[PDB]
Design a protein around this ligand. Structure first.
Ligand SMILES: *[C@@H]1O[C@H](CO)[C@@H](O)[C@H](O)[C@H]1NC(C)=O
Ligand SMILES: *[C@@H]1O[C@H](CO)[C@@H](O)[C@H](O)[C@H]1NC(C)=O
Ligand SMILES: *[C@@H]1O[C@H](CO)[C@@H](O)[C@H](O)[C@H]1NC(C)=O
Ligand SMILES: *[C@@H]1O[C@H](CO)[C@@H](O)[C@H](O)[C@H]1NC(C)=O
Ligand SMILES: *[C@@H]1O[C@H](CO)[C@@H](O)[C@H](O)[C@H]1NC(C)=O
Ligand SMILES: *[C@@H]1O[C@H](CO)[C@@H](O)[C@H](O)[C@H]1NC(C)=O
Ligand SMILES: *[C@@H]1O[C@H](CO)[C@@H](O)[C@H](O)[C@H]1NC(C)=O
Ligand SMILES: *[C@@H]1O[C@H](CO)[C@@H](O)[C@H](O)[C@H]1NC(C)=O
Ligand SMILES: *[C@@H]1O[C@H](CO)[C@@H](O)[C@H](O)[C@H]1NC(C)=O
Ligand SMILES: *[C@@H]1O[C@H](CO)[C@@H](O)[C@H](O)[C@H]1NC(C)=O
Ligand SMILES: *[C@@H]1O[C@H](CO)[C@@H](O)[C@H](O)[C@H]1NC(C)=O
Ligand SMILES: *[C@@H]1O[C@H](CO)[C@@H](O)[C@H](O)[C@H]1NC(C)=O
Lengths: 268, 268, 268, 268, 268, 268
């Protein structure tokens, strides 16, 4: 191959990562806010090169390569937790946050971002506006939220909606102090889950497209699908929903152009 | 003086310190339990010799000399706190327990007995039945309790007694676990308050009453009234409520016998 | 398989776990006490459900699946160690307790049960009755107890049976106090070690036996020997010590019934 | 006394305490910033009401009585130091800040106001902008500022104006991290200094100025001069520099009215 | 007064502060080594100005003024303790060291000099040669040395020279390691006690003797006795053991010259 | 095999570890000193048996098996750090010392030796002769040394080589004190890296050389190459740079003796 032919869709607007990562108030972990990111371009090397983030652990994908991939959808989950609970935001972990507040699936393709927010979220005299669910009958399914406020019966006696002996309120405040220990500062956590459905991808990295070159052995990056071959005109009539064609060997024979919406036939 | 004579009333019922120190369940610090001890002989040797009481700080009375004195009324304040906040139970300190839960007066005459109770008040998974008042409008008065449960407004919004943003429950749980450190481990605290007024003493030690030896220079202890003199037979007509007697110079010159109700002149 | 058949020997006495776990005085770690448990029914549910054991770590056996398995004999090793020495009671770990006091094998099968015992093993002023072996020439073998009290020759000079310079006593006191931190607090440790030999299993869980079903395909648990097959009456004669009849293919072909003493061939 | 009279000069402007306490960037402790507060009304109650301040130690004047008094001049000193070194801002105290950076007089009249400033002064990657003088040949005199950057010589070898072995820069960077403990936490300290010398007082509390009641026995606070008397007219020839007279008994008997510049007589 | 006359005895030999402080191995605190120091010039500013001692806290005398004083005898008591126990070497303090190992009288006059000794007194694997007395029936008297090794009876059972249950060895090892914390770190402590009683002075400071001038008003420092007066010839026949002279007014009116053994009349 | 033949060359001098480990002064971590050790005998068991080395971690070799295997060349890297960043001297670890001062490759072969030096590298009042590189624009490559003293521009403004606002000096002082904590105490670190490139061995340990026995199946160690064979005589034409010889089977079959320059055929 001589030169790569990158074809990405003609998207003009950047993804609203700034509003998600720089918002004034984040939600509590029991009622975490999920934002749907779609139909835009997202720069992921801005997040990595910024040294504000204490944690940038990515599972199932590499953080440096994130600008080269087109995901179908992005879900951004934002909440505030304790410092010692940051390690519970991982696939296959146990604890109060993992079981009762935010559960990550084992088959997780995404990145976990955690930065210290002692400056903006903590307050002297106590910031008790951040609460976490401490009591639940059963553990949470992955990507499930619990906003219930029913009194957790921890004994034989019914509670009748009144707090007291063995009847506790399900949500407990953190009590954040600026004079707290290293494990007790507020941490804002944004979990970026990359949905990779077999669909037209709408969140692409910031890569400049290259105009189409055919009839020669070239590299190509069609919607994040890297390959090498000769691109020719395809007689095959793809259905409108269909975006890829798979041979008997499960390798893409043809791809629908993401800019001019035509069919190109890949040959080795 | 030749010999020492001690005359006490013939009270043989032992004071209920077993109910105070060996109760199955204590109460929370916001609703600390007060017990009135009177009209019994008190044994403070069993408190002093015990090898479980980590803190035995006595204010206004010597801890070794608890057995010698006589009092009228004893107030036992039992509650459960954590280790770091045991130091707040003293005259003149600040903190959440001192300001909003239990305040000791600066003129406190009594002892503070604190011992670790990690085995009885901690449960694996958390023992949340012990609560403390965390928010209050104004600091507490000495020997004042606040068992009201009203939602504390921490902002400028009238939120109608529903927990949420800037409206917090007044009581917060300790959440005791056996794995927690000694700063956050349960400590049972019994505060003994002795009041010595111009009243006949009802709480005394187990000091034996000796025989009445008159017309000799003896050291004497009549119901806690120590001194030296030559006790003889009197002709004064005390009224039944009148225990001792005073001269023109406001010095004790006659006492009533605790046992046989006989008036004895103390000449020096 | 249509039905499930469980056959266990008709033994009814409970195993003396109460004597092991609720004893008033535990021995020191250098002279740890091993008790042989056999010929009884062991209910491991009462250990698991109760919330006092801070550390409950099983190696080689799933902790929640203790009830269904049958063991030949159980050895319970009890001792007292401080909080930072709890992590050394594990296979493959190092430390003073692992090298000189109690060493577990790398192939250990069983559970480690450690709970805080600050009330029973600490007195104010120091509880020095719990000693650990501090000096030894060589590390201990697995499950080997050393109670020798010769003076340790640290230097090049003969000790001559007197403590002095470069000659130390091998045992050293913990010195527990209730004010000490959780690293220096008493923990009572019971190590359950299960052996699975060719002997008949005597320590079985609280699972209840069912009726024997013959000539039909069932799923059977014969005294811990799980399997599936058509149980049929056999003409095989087993010697009294022999309990099962593995063939040339190392698969269980016949089992002696633990109650009625019947030889039962298994057809797949 | 029939009533109370408070006569203060007709000063309208509020004191610029917003530009001192809420300044964007404080100076370092080696070059601490001193601001002269005069000719304005000062409200010290609003400083005491805020719970942001973690240290409000006032020496020689009580914090509750701050609004009552009047002063001629206020010296507002501001700097940033770590949490462990807050205690060295005290009269008759020793330390690095006391010897080399900021020394208070042994008889100091004012308030040391220190609050935690983690949110304003810390940043990720460390805020090293705040420097403290660590090396000096001699200890600092009280209220003396040293901004010399000469290289301190520790050994006999002359430094020659370059950094090297035994020749160190006199200023050391603090190294404030958001993840540091409370010991190394950035704290902003404001040291208010008051002069009690007799002069025309320019700064007073927010107390309302009442009318002038003559020939009736009233309490008075004439520009901070507390007393009780019958305020009558005077025929004394007060010169312009003379603000309050005195008698042969060295007691205050004639005070100039601050608003009218009219001499009044205090009659007991 | 015109001149100042210092007369000290003609001694030149320096007493071994080097052997006290720079010894290779010190002694344990239960068997602290006391050395008698007499007939020497002692340069206390060598110990004061050297940046080697972490603590140089002096009781009853100023450390800077020690060069200008003369004492009859100096006791140097050297031992090794831990960092947290350095505080306990003081009058009116409690602990294990103060009660059982080294006790200081309440009228103590001297200095306590403590410096860290990590490289000398620690070893990887534990340095156990430094022992402290942990058990004693009664508290120690001031300056009492106890080197007895008898088994402490902490219970009712006789011990009979065998260590075991409730029978402990009285000496307990520190167990120093170089990786230990600064509280558990080996500190060498030397306590200097000065006999200021009425006796011939032997230990004197490095002040140089000046020539004797008579019949004028001069300040004088005769063997550490300071005054102002006129020195003249005296007819008082002193007995050879007598140094000072005194009258009914309890004032020193005659002294003996340290060098010429001449009796001088101090006329004021 | 019958006996083992260990053949080491005729080397008489010892490797100069004395000034590497027991030098009076060490260099700082930014200017880490490197010493090349070759052509001598090194006794690693002296370092192994030392009672002062707290950390003796090794990578790519066993800490027990370092003496018997002998290496081509030894690079000794010496620097002083504090106790917290001892863990940062490991491959793959991230930190200030790792990124900016001393970086080890991920395939590092050798041993890290660290020991506390609080009595040598700390002085009362502070020892500031040991510096570390705090700021660098890029992370260091493995084994590169950067001693540049250029002013680190931390802001946008060009300040032209002067210290000031965001123009920090790159080096900073540890500031060791004897009373500091174990994290802030000096630790001398000697990294002993070894390369195993294709070259004749120059440093080998103190193991003695045995006489040759030919025509018998003996275990042999020919200067780091260990095998089993019948070392018969040869007739090879080995050029003087050929240390050993390999056949078509890619196995060692001819070794020239290091002590006699005689080629020996290894026959299986
Ligand atoms: C949030 O604001 C800061 C301040 O300018 C900026 O550096 C950062 O890049 C912003 N975050 C995002 C995701 O743009
Ligand atoms: C953008 O892409 C669409 C197909 O996705 C195409 O129809 C349209 O013409 C493109 N816009 C421009 C300006 O080329
Ligand atoms: C509580 O019970 C224990 C049980 O032996 C006893 O020793 C102790 O004296 C009791 N407490 C009081 C105050 O009597
Ligand atoms: C006991 O005291 C009472 C006073 O209440 C008295 O009446 C009675 O006689 C006394 N009894 C004896 C045996 O002293
Ligand atoms: C020990 O005694 C307690 C007392 O309630 C009981 O709950 C526990 O089950 C006992 N332990 C065992 C192993 O039976
Ligand atoms: C109990 O087991 C024994 C086996 O030794 C057997 O002989 C006996 O019949 C059994 N009893 C019952 C009631 O099953
Ligand atoms: C600084 O700003 C805060 C913001 O609300 C305010 O509450 C405070 O009073 C201000 N400080 C002063 C001295 O005015
Ligand atoms: C304000 O004070 C000045 C002098 O103190 C006086 O001359 C003037 O009349 C006053 N004005 C008012 C309105 O009181
Ligand atoms: C101990 O030896 C060192 C070595 O130079 C010396 O500086 C110090 O002054 C000596 N101390 C005494 C008390 O002699
Ligand atoms: C030294 O002092 C003695 C008295 O103790 C005296 O007899 C002698 O003459 C003195 N010598 C000198 C040289 O001053
Ligand atoms: C000493 O070394 C030389 C050169 O390496 C060698 O030729 C000689 O044989 C050696 N000496 C002995 C006794 O082997
Ligand atoms: C450094 O000196 C000590 C002094 O005994 C010695 O034990 C040690 O072996 C020396 N270090 C080396 C590397 O030889």
């Amino acid at each position: 191959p001589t030169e790569s032919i990158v074809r990405f869709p003609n998207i003009t607007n950047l993804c609203p990562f700034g509003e998600v990562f720089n918002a004034t108030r984040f939600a509590s972990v029991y009622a975490w806010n999920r934002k749907r990111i779609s139909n835009c371009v997202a720069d992921y090397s801005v997040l990595y090169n910024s040294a504000s983030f204490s944690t940038f652990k990515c599972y199932g994908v590499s953080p440096t390569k994130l600008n080269d991939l087109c995901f179908t959808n992005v879900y951004a989950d934002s909440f505030v937790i304790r410092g010692d609970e940051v390690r519970q935001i991982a696939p296959g972990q146990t604890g109060k946050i993992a079981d009762y507040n935010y559960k990550l699936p084992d088959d997780f393709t995404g990145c976990v971002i955690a930065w210290n927010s002692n400056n903006l979220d903590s307050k002297v005299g106590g910031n008790y506006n951040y609460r976490y669910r401490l009591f639940r009958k059963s553990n949470l399914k992955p990507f499930e939220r619990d906003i219930s406020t029913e009194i957790y019966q921890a004994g034989s006696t019914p509670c009748n909606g009144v707090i007291g002996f063995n009847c506790y309120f399900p949500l407990q405040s953190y009590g954040f102090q600026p004079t707290n220990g290293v494990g007790y500062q507020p941490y804002r956590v944004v979990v970026l889950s990359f949905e990779l459905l077999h669909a037209p991808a709408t969140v692409c990295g910031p890569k400049k497209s290259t105009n189409l070159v055919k009839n020669k052995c070239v590299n190509f990056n069609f919607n994040g699908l890297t390959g090498t071959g000769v691109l020719t005109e395809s007689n095959k009539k793809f259905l409108p929903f269909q975006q890829f064609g798979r041979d008997i060997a499960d390798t893409t024979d043809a791809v629908r152009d993401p800019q001019t919406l035509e069919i190109l036939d890949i040959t080795p």
